Amino acid sequence: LTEEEKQQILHSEEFLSFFDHSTRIVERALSEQINIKLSLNRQFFDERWSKHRVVSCLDWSSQYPELLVASYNNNEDAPHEPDGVALVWNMKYKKTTPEYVFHCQSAVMSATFAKFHPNLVVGGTYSGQIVLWDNRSNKRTPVQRTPLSAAAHTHPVYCVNVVGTQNAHNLISISTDGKICSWSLDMLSHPQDSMELVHKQSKAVAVTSMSFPVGDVNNFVVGSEEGSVYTACRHGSKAGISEMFEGHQGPITGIHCHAAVGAVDFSHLFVTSSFDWTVKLWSTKNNKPLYSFEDNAGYVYDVMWSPTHPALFACVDGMGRLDLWNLNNDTEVPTASISVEGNPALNRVRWTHSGREIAVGDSEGQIVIYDVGEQIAVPRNDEWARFGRTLAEINAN
Amino acid sequence: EVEETLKRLQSQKGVQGIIVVNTEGIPIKSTMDNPTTTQYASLMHSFILKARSTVRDIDPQNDLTFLRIRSKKNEIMVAPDKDYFLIVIQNPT
Amino acid sequence: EVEETLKRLQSQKGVQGIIVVNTEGIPIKSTMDNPTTTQYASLMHSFILKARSTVRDIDPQNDLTFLRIRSKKNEIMVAPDKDYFLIVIQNPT
Amino acid sequence: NTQEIFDDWARKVQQRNLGVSGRIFTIESTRVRGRTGNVLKLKVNFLPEIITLSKEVRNLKWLGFRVPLA
Amino acid sequence: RIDRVETRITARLRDQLGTAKNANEMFRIFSRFNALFVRPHIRGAIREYQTQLIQRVKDDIESLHDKFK
DSSP states (O other), X not given: OOHHHHXXXXXXXXXXXXXXXXXXXXXHTTSOOOOOOOOOOEEEOBTTTBSSOEEOOOOBOSSSSSOBEEEEEOOSSOSXXXXXXXXXXXXXXXXXXXXXXXXXXXXXXXXXXXXXXSSEEEEEETTSOXXXXXXXXXXXXXXXXXXXXXXXXXXXXXXXXXXXXXSSOEEEEEOTTSEEEEEOSSOOSSOSXXXXXXXXXXXXXXOOSOOOOTTTOSXXXXXXXXXXXXXXXXXXXXXXXXXEEOOOOSOEEEEEOOOSOOSSOOOOEEEEEETTSEEEEEETTOSSOSEEEEEOSSOOOOEEEOSSSTTEEEEOOSSOXXXXXXXXXXXXXXXXXXXXXXXXXXXXXXXXXXXXXXXXXXXXXXXXXXXXXXXXXXXXXXXXXXXXHHHHHHSOO | OHHHHXXXXXXXXXXXEEOBOOTTSSOSBOXXXXXXXXXXXXXXXXXXXXXXXXXXXXXXXXXXXXXXXXXXXXXXXXXXXXXXXXXXXEOOO | OHHHHHHHTTSSTTEEEEOOOXXXXXXXSOSSOIIIIIIHHHHHHHHHHHHHHHHHHHOTTOXXXXXXXXXXXXXXXXXXXXXXXXXXXXXXX | OOSSHHHHHHXXXXXXXXXXXXXXXOSXXXXXXXXXXXXXXXXXXXXXXXXXXXXXXXXXXXXXXXXXXX | OXXXXXXXXXXXXXXXXXXXXXXXXXXXXXXXXXXXXXXXXHHHHHHHHHHHHXXXXXXXXXXXXXXXX
C-alpha cells in the first residue's frame, strides 16, 4: 500500500527471482499467435545497449545452442551507462530484445562462453579483466572479476578460451604482452598457470583473438604483430611462443583453427584473417603460406571454420561482405557471399557449433546471423586432401 | 531496473497495462487507472485462487505456471508464480 | 468427421487425454473413466463458467473465446462452444 | 609502401605514446577530476591511449613500418 | 606437340581467365597453364587474357591506394 512497503518489497532479496521469472514468462508469452544461397536470417539490435558499441567478439555456445555472446566495446558515447556490454540473444524463440544483458565496469573484449558451464559467461575487458557473469543473478554486474597483478593480466584481454576436459578445465586468457594465464572457472581471484610468451625479438607479441584446434590442446595460434602466427603452448618447456608462421604482412584480426571434423581428415590447418586484406590458409605444421586468398576490399576482421563443413570458412571485410569459401569446388573465388545493409565494418565471424549458421559481428551494435542448408558434411574426405595437395603443388611456382 | 521492466514489457503491442497484482490483492505494480483495475485485480486474484484450486485439486503434484484467458475482446494472460502473481491484458494484435 | 480427428490425435506428441464436455459439465464422448473425464471436465466447466462471469464482471460484452492452462505436468486447452465446452489435456513437452 | 599512416602511428608511438607505450614514468597516473566517491580514481596517460599502445606495437611492427627512435 | 600443348594451354587459361577475372583470380587463371603463360604462341593469348587480368590488377592496386586513403 505505502511507498515504503512497496519499495522495500520490490527491492527485497526475494523479488530478484520474481523479476527474473516475470521477465522470462512475459517475454516467453511474446510470441504472437494466430486465430484465423544465403538466407540472411536475422539482425540483433538493442537500444540501450547496442548503438555505436562495436562488437568485440562473438562466441557460439557449445552447451545450450543458438546462444552467442555478443561482447561490446562501449565507446565514449554514454559514460553513465556501465561500460562493456555482453548481450545474450535467442534464435529458437525469435525475439527482438536481448535475453539477458551482461554489462560490466569496463569495455568487455572477446567475451565467450565457458564449456561444461551452464551459467558462466566469461569475458575480457578494457580494464584487462576477464570478468565473469552468472545467468542466475538478476543484477547484470559481474560478480567475479580478474586481478591486474604482474602475474595476472595487464593488457585488455582480447581473447579468452577454454582448454581441457572435465579433469583440468582451464580458462586460457591471453593479453597482448604474451601473458597467457590459465584461470579456474569457479574462483577468479588467482590465476592457475600464469606466464608470458617470451619471443626472441619483441617478446610482447600483440596476440589477436586466438583459437585452438579440435581436441583442446595447449597450442594456440598467435596472431602476431605481422602475421607470424605463433602456435604456442602453456605448460612444459614449449610453453610460450613455440612455432612461427611468417610470410605475412599484417596484424591478424581473427584467427581460428580447425573446427569439429565433419566428413574429411583432421586437417591440422588454421586460417588467418588479417589487415592484409586477404585471407590465408595455413597448416599447423607448414611454416609456408599454404594458400593466400583474393585481396578482399578492406581488411579481414574475422574468419571461422564450420564444424558441419570443415573445408570452408567465412571471412569479413570493412565494406561489409561476408564471404564463405569452400575449396573442394573453388580455387581462387569465394563460394557464397552476402552483405549487410549499408557498409558496416563487419568485425566478427563465428560459425555455430552445429554448423551451417554464421554469426556476423557488424560495425556497431547489430549482430546478423545467417543460415544455410546447402553446405553439409558431404563425405569428400579424399577430395579435400587431394585439393590441399594440389594447392601444395601449384603454390610452388 | 523495475522501470526498465515496465517499459520493456509494456513495449510489446497489445499490452494495455502491466497491472501486476500480488497475492494480497493490492496493485503492487501498475500503470493504468488504479480504481478501475483495483476491482479487476481483486476479482482476478480471487479467480486466480480458483485456478490454483483447480490445478491443486485435479492433480496433486501439479503446479500452475501460466494461464491464457482468450476473451472475446482481449487476451487476459495471467502469469502466476510461486509467491505472487501477474495480470497482463494483451489484445489479439 | 470427429473420428479421424480423434484417431489423428492419438499418436500425437504427448497426449494425456482427448475428451470433450457434452451436457453442460457432463461429458459423453469419454476416452477415460468417470472421474478423469466427467468430474475433471465438470470442475473445468464450472471454473471456466466462473471465468466467463469474471471477464463478464470486467465487461459483460467480453465473454470467453479460448483457455490455455499450461503447467508443469499438463497443458489443458479449453475450447468454449455455445452450450457444451471442450477440454483437451496435453503434455507440456 | 611509405610512411603516411605509418608515419602518423610512428609519431603517435613517439610522442603521443611516450607516456603510454613507453610509459616508464606513467606507472601510477591517477585522475584529478570530479566523480562520485572521492577516492583514488585514475585516468592514466595510456588509459584512453589503448589505440596509442596498440598502434605502437601493431603499427611499428605491422610490416616493419615507420617508427621513430623514441 | 609444343604448339598443340600451347594451344590447349591457352584454351584452358582463356576459359579460366574469362571466368576468373580479378587481380589474383585472372592472374593465376591465365597462369594456370604453364605453356599458356610460357610458350610465345600461347603467350600472345596469355597477353590477350592479361589485357583484362592486368586491368583487374590495376583496379586492385588503384582501389588499394583508395582504400589506404
